[PDB]
Amino acid sequence: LSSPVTKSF
Amino acid sequence: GSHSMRYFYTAMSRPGRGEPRFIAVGYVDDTQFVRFDSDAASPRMAPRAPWIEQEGPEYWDGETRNMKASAQTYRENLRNARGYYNQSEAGSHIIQVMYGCDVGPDGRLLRGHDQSAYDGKDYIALNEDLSSWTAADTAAQITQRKWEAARVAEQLRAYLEGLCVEWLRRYLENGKETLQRADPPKTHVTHHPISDHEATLRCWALGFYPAEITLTWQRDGEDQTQDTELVETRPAGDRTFQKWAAVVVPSGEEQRYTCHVQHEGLPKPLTLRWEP
């Protein structure tokens, strides 16, 4: 199951 | 014994060729189980292992939505990154991410990972502590500050300690027959004369799973690390892997060389020689 976490640079 | 779950994301810009391509691949150890490609006719998170097919509609719909949202975020990241590096709007650039969890035989968290790259160079990585970051340069420091302000490390640790660990344990049970089975290498030594006074001894290892393996040549019980040609471990196309190690030996000295094989699938390290 993939990360549901937004990683905006 | 020990297992890992990893997701590999590639976001590549292509100016004048539409929007950046976003590709995500999910693995349990060396077995791919899911893929998402924005360039597919109809992008969806898609099965790539039989044991995942049993997952219900809520899984596939939840994962597809997450991928499209990830695809959008990484498309914005590529715009930001170009800006952070004072780059031209003409060049093609790549963001890469690799994240996941490692568990032991008990299925307890050994360690978590969240590494990112920009054009094949390290950009930012979540530290082993799952609370702080390692920014590779001043541009990655801007990303660090945005993440330290939004406490992204906490949200990651919560995923890496909870969901990543829980889901990998479930996949391991579902794919029990394959994921928890190690296939030992099928080994042999070949001999090829080069000249009157030299010959190549090649130590083969085939049909092994997982990919991790150690192939070494010893001359009189001494590792031949420098003179050993080692090819990169390569997939056979059937889940298994192949590798070889070669050494150039003087003619008549073949019996002084031994190939040593270490693999998870083997009860004890193998020792083989050329059998003429």
């Binding site: - | 090829h192 090819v231 390569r234 997939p235």
Partner: protein, 99 residues
Amino acid sequence: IQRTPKIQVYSRHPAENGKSNFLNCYVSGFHPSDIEVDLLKNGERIEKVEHSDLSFSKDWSFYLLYYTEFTPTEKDEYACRVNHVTLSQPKIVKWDRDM
């Protein structure tokens, strides 16, 4: 900034003349991801060649496996033709049963 692909041409199972198999071309260690790979039967492009989904190693370099079903013979010569930004002209690696 840019990494040249390593190329390996080999068969899925050990090669037996007249017996069905899979010819593989494994391209790895390359950066950026854009790559052109062709499987050659006596110098001509084999159609229908499938490939693995794009992925990469711990050092960020990409890897792909290109494969097709084939029946080796003593006469038939096989090869892999690869092109990438780091290469002036395409690189041909001939298939050798012993590598």
